[PDB]
Structure formats: C-alpha cells, structure tokens
Write a protein that binds this DNA or RNA. Structure first.
Ligand code: NA
Ligand code: NA
Length: 316
DNA sequence: CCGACAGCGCATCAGC
DNA sequence: GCTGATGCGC
DNA sequence: GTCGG
C-alpha cells in the first residue's frame, strides 16, 4: 500500500472527478484501470517513464506521476479539491440514486450537503431518499461472516417458497472475498426457461429481511436488506434468470472482470463465443450457431476444453 | 486520425 | 395515454 | 485517457 499508494490515491481521485464532474465515464475507467495495474505493480515507481511500461498507463498519466513524485502533489488536483462546486458535486454522488447528472442539478440550485438534501426531500425521488436514509450504512463493507448469515437466510426462505428454486450468491463473495459491498443473488426455477421473483421477494419481506425496495419488476429486483438483531442496512439485488441461461449467468456474475475477459479470449480460440447468457459454437466464417445446452458451470469449461477453475481462483 | 471502451433492467424524464 | 431518451446501479 | 486498427 505504501509502495505506490500516493500515486494510486491520486489516480482514484482523478477518476472520481472525471466520472462525477466531467461526466466522462471512459476517462474514469481509464484512470481506474491505471490505478489497478499500478496497485498490482510489486515495485516502488521512481518515474513516469517506468510506469508507462505498464498497460493502461500512457503519456498523460506518466506526466502526472512525474509531477507527483517531484512535488508530492498535483496542481490540477489541488484546484479541484479547493473547488466548492466540484467537491460538492463529487460528494453528492456518494448518495445511492444520485449520479453525476442529479448531483449537478442539485448543486446548481444551491443543494450541496446531506443537510441540504434533508431540507429538500420533495426534490428527491424514492431511490435517492433511500440512499440518503442509509448513507452511512451503504458506505460500509460487509464482512464475510455477515454475508454468510445473509446467505443462510436467502437460501432458507427461497427454499420455503418452492423447493425447486435454485439460488446462488455471486460476486466477490463467491470468489471467497473477506468482505463485499453488496449481495448479488442469482435465482432460477425449472419452470422458467427461454411471477417467480415477486414470490421470493415477498417472503424475504415477510420475515423482515428485505426492508426497502429500490426497483422491482419481472426479472431484476434491487432493494435494501438487514440482518436481525442493530446491523447496518445492506444493498441487495436478486436476478431471475432462465434455467438454460443460469450457469452462464452464475459464471458471468461471479467474475472477476479480468477473469471473464480472459475466458472469452480463450473461448474464441477454441471456436466458441461466451457472453452473459449463452455459449455458442462459431462457424468457419464466424457465424454463431445455436446456444449450447448448459446444465452446470463445469459444462462451460468443458466446451472450451479448459480446466475447471474454482471461484476462489478467478481473480485473474 | 479516430472509434472502442459492457451494457442490461428498471425508474424517471422529455416529447407527442 | 403512449413511445423513446436519459439516468442510475451494477 | 489509453489502446489499437
Ligand atoms: Na503503457
Ligand atoms: Na450515487
């Protein structure tokens, strides 16, 4: 952390500025990508030229690293920090439901703080009110032990609605992470292939696990949950996926991002194409065939003739 | 030089 | 009322 | 902002 933490912190702060104030999502991802590859770099960087050797780091970031190494700061960043508007816009986006556009709208009309948000509840939609209500809780990490307890409840209540349901908690949790930011549940049922979600949601509300709803329709639910005691309120999403697309979904939403990118790359070489939903064979001219039958996660690995990777070892 | 960079489900906004 | 765009989370 | 056609 102390190795290149100053550089990675700088790039992260620049990333947030680009996403929230400039609304340039690709510059945000560019800075994040650079911060990530530097955070994995097992050496204390001595120059921008050294860092430019890394993929994701180009001329501009190399220049910024040079300034940071020689002065301990970035003139552009310091000005951004001392900017009332930019800092207020940046902060407001920390409220769930408030993105760059809403934050801009709020700051433009004098709304800059949480207190300003509370005084103006009428200007906030339902999601933003919930985000405001659980501002502190939503910025807390979820320790794995709590994730296990939360998993216990979800699997139990899901089985109670119908024992033919299949539920899988994915995300970094499934990869064995010590902590998570939210709970991502993937749900399926043999009767559904290509009102099942409501029944499960309703039951989780019935036992007071789900406390609030952010967005709810046929296939994807977003809401708020809480362990019984007081535990912090947590963000939870539940996805209803067709049975024949389930394990492709489980694979996709388990990750990691870098892992999926590599598995798709290997699949391409073997003559298969993998997305979120299906794995399809490719023709001699590049045409994708019909979706292949998938009944387990290992089936996908079998098509690619790849050794099955345990979720624990899917960080890359 | 210049386009890609993930994009889908859902809520809300803009226009008819 | 509707359709399509925009915003947001992940 | 960086990469690559
Ligand atoms: Na580079
Ligand atoms: Na936000």
């Amino acid at each position: 952390e102390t190795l290149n933490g100053g550089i990675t912190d700088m790039l992260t702060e620049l990333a947030n500025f680009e996403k929230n104030v400039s609304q340039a999502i690709h510059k945000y991802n560019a800075y994040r990508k650079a911060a990530s590859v530097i955070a994995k770099y097992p050496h204390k960087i001595k120059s921008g030229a050294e860092a430019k050797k890394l993929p994701g780091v180009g001329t501009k970031i190399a220049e910024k690293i040079d300034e940071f190494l020689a002065t301990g700061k970035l003139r552009k960043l310091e000005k951004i920090r001392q900017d009332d508007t930019s800092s207020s816009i940046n902060f407001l986006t920390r409220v769930s439901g408030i993105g760059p556009s809403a934050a801009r709208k709020f700051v433009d009309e004098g709304i800059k703080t949480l207190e300003d948000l509370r005084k103006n509840e009428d200007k906030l939609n339902h999601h933003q009110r919930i985000g405001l209500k659980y501002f502190g809780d939503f910025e807390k990490r979820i320790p794995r032990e709590e994730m296990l307890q939360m998993q216990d409840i979800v699997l139990n209540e899901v089985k109670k609605v119908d024992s033919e349901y299949i539920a899988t908690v994915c995300g970094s949790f499934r990869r064995g992470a010590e902590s998570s930011g939210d709970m991502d549940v993937l749900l399926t049922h043999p009767s559904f292939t290509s009102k099942l979600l409501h029944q499960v949601v309703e039951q989780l509300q019935k036992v007071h696990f789900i406390t609030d709803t952010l967005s709810k329709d046929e296939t994807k639910f977003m809401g708020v949950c809480q362990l019984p005691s007081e535990y912090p309120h947590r963000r939870i999403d539940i996805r209803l996926i067709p049975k024949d697309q389930y394990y492709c979904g489980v694979l996709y939403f388990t990750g990691s991002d870098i892992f999926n990118k590599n598995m798709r790359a290997h699949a391409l070489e073997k003559g298969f194409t993998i997305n979120e939903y299906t794995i399809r064979p490719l023709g001699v001219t590049g045409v994708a065939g019909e979706p292949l039958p998938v009944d387990s996660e290992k089936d996908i690995f079998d098509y690619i003739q790849w050794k099955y990777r345990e979720p624990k070892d899917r960080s890359e």
